[PDB]
Amino acid sequence: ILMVDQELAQESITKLDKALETVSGVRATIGAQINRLEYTMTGLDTTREN
């Protein structure tokens, strides 16, 4: 990515948008896994109690 002349800014904006979407997707995957593990927390304790 270069910001030297008045032609690369448009390509820069496109690449930045695509990178932002990629980061958002990876964060979403992390959140999904953490929520699944949080749900699987409690059944183990209930089984231990029984």
Place this chain on the structure above:
Amino acid sequence: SEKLRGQISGLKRASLNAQDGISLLQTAEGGLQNIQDMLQRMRELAVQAG
């Protein structure tokens, strides 16, 4: 006397078997409750979209 002794012993054994049975159903209902808890969150995030 012999018949009464035998009946007493059998009744005691049945009394033990009863609680032996009840524990298993308690475990089963715990597991079912966990599954039912998950299903409603699925339905909520289902009605989210549309």
